[PDB]
From a paper:
The roles of RNA sequence/structure motifs, Packaging Signals (PSs), for regulating assembly of an [name] genome transcript have been investigated in an efficient in vitro assay containing only [name] (Cp) and RNA. The 3200 bp long genome encodes four overlapping reading frames for polymerase (Pol); surface proteins (HBsAg); the cell regulatory factor protein X; and the core and pre-core proteins ([name] and HBeAg, respectively).
After data collection, 127,410 T = 4 (84%) and 23,257 T = 3 (16%) particles were chosen for further analysis. A homogenous dataset of the remaining T = 4 particles was subjected to icosahedrally-averaged refinement yielding a ~3.2 Å resolution map. This reconstruction reveals a Cp layer similar to those seen in previous EM and crystal structures. At this resolution, the four distinct Cp monomers of the quasi-equivalent capsomer, chains A-D, can be built using polypeptide chains 144, 143, 144 and 147 residues long, respectively. The icosahedrally-ordered Cp surface lattice surrounds a second, less-ordered internal layer of density, which may well include density for the encapsidated [name] transcript and the Cp ARD domains. Reconstruction of the same dataset without the imposition of symmetry fails to reveal any further molecular detail at 4.2 Å resolution, the internal density appearing as a mostly continuous layer underneath the Cp shell. Symmetry expansion suggests that there are multiple contacts between this internal density and the outer shell at particle symmetry axes. It is not possible at the resolutions obtained to assign this internal density to either the C-terminal Cp ARD domains, the [name] transcript or a complex of both.
Author numbering:
A (entry chain B), D (entry chain B): 1 to 143
B (entry chain A), C (entry chain A), F (entry chain C): 1 to 144
E (entry chain D): 1 to 147
The structure:
Amino acid sequence: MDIDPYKEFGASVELLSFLPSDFFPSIRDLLDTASALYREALESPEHCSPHHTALRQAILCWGELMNLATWVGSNLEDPASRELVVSYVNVNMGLKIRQLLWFHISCLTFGRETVLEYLVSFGVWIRTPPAYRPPNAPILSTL
Amino acid sequence: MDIDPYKEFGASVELLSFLPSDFFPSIRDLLDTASALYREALESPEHCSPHHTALRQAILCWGELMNLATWVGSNLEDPASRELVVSYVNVNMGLKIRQLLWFHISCLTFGRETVLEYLVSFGVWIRTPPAYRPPNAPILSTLP
Amino acid sequence: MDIDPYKEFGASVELLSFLPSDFFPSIRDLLDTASALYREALESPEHCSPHHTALRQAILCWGELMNLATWVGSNLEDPASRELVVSYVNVNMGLKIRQLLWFHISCLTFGRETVLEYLVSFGVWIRTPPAYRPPNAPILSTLP
Amino acid sequence: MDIDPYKEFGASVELLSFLPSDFFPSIRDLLDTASALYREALESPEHCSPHHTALRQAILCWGELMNLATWVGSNLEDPASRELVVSYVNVNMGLKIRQLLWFHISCLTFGRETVLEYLVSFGVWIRTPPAYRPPNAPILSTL
Amino acid sequence: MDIDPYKEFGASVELLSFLPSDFFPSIRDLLDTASALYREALESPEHCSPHHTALRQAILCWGELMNLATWVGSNLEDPASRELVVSYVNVNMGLKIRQLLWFHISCLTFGRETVLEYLVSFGVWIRTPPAYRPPNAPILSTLPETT
Amino acid sequence: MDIDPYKEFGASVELLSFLPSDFFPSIRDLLDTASALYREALESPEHCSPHHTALRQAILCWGELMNLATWVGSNLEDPASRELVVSYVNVNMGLKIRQLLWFHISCLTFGRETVLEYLVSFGVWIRTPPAYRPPNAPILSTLP
């Protein structure tokens, strides 16, 4: 079956594909801003928010992916083949978990209606050619 | 942060450790149960339950892991180290979503309080010495 | 004084003698059931039930017996008489807390009246001649 | 898991660790004052008190420890190794069952609020050096 | 800043200097006393008293001093100069917080005015010559010695 | 007894480790602004705040640590121990006293909620890639 993870939150993969690769902070920097803002709500028996439920799964999805890269570096025989796998988890599979971590942290920080309104205006900006756009990208921090 | 995937739903990792490792059905058998029973709701544009939201992320977590096992199939021309990676995803990494898929499919079908009471009742069954346990295990089939 | 540990809870030593000796699960299997199900309450600063108060003393009684078996491990340099002591605590002394841990975990999970009725119902089952008893024993799994 | 046996009664192991070893009577003298004061309440099907439930377990804990020392003296081969075990049950494991027997007998005799108020004032007295304390320890017998 | 830890609570350093140096119990004996009676309050998410706010920093002051003495042991390969620093942390720096732990535990247990009247009455007792001094020193027990 | 020094003030060690380590002003500058702004209120027979009660103990803790450093500089014959100990006391304990002094001085100056919001905002600002944040770092300021 075909599930996009954002459709229950009012977005799509097509809406978040306009953000470039160097728009999201690193995965260590998304896990730090969740552990420092919402830790008593993520380590809680309550449901709190639907953005809290999807953020708990995205953290433990990465904790098993960092569990994989520790296994790959420990018990593969040749070092040549193991350097493609750990580079795949951090870069290729790590990019999909950044925008999952970015979307749910920002929907808790700024609001869900603000992030969806920002993703429209960022899509207009990056679809415009660089000669006909303002030089600075729009930012989020309304608060 | 030591975050618990089942504490939100009134369970724990140590309560899910009452069931053995080779008790959960395979991932292909659990994704067909999700397809046949809950496909209009997992593809719905609204979250219907907290179990649906944790189940949509559990399928995409396995979908990311199947793009990985396809990638190690197409790459890593050393053949002896390719089979170490793709069998790790299918066996070792596939287990921790297999408890995650089993817990959320069964809590959508039978309810929260039925699966939590089944987790205790399977705890009594596997604890009993083999001279005094029944030959049948408990099944979640509360429905006729 | 000939004091009865289960008479307070509506049972007796001779009603607990309906179950055989090798029916109760091991002490490591019963302390994990107490850990997974009742750890906020056994470490609570208030007594929640008379079964909690008798269960906190049953765990500390085994905790005193494990400091003893560690002490006979570190001391008693005669090796033939060290193994007589530590196997007595694990097998012989560990049994009378194993009925004590089983009775209070099961009475917190299923209730008093369910375990007392299970003690009678297991009495009928073990009494029946083997030509006419079922191949299944009763389990306390009243919960689905 | 980590349980202290006194926390449900409003005390701790840290509160009762200030009482010295020679503060409690012998285990035969704690079992005599329970069998002579509360025997119709300990040999009873009722719950009576939470101090009664914890006292029933502490008596039968010692009855299995005296069962052990009878076994050790009967069927160990050498007498040299058996004299360390029976001295361990009576002294080392016997000291932990004295303060369990003392705390629950005294909470029934004087009251729970009196024993906790006495354990504070006995802690002030024995933490004071002997040159700056009164020479007599405080006593319990308010009745 | 000529600042004073007890001046806020109605005392002084010199009023705490009535008690001698070898009067306060050891740091292990006040940490066991604090954790016995005040552990849900010293780890509470709110401040309960100015004694609780000042006792949380005094335990944290001792915690930073014990990670220091641990660090001097794992490092500092000269044994002649290592042991005199760990001795300075334990017996010299620990004395200034033993008065801080004793003062704030006792004002939580018996009250501010009871400890402040005890410091005066122990001041009369210790400056009396030993020929005219009574045998039983003052003590801030809430119960009498005969109960 | 595990006590968080900022827990009663609505923060934690994790929220103050959210900012980088070389952000907090030095211990000399923080004691300078404490002695400039709040000296008649820290040398006072009143409490006036929980922040004043914590700031006095922080200043006295740093005074005891500087007495320690003066003592180690006074009498230790090993020159490498004078290189190790008083550099540890500065660069490892002064960072924690820098966070404590900065937190309490800023909470006295700007308010507690403004300092907590500034902690969250500056952490998320540092974490953000530089092309998608405001170009200059935020400060607390009382000047309109």
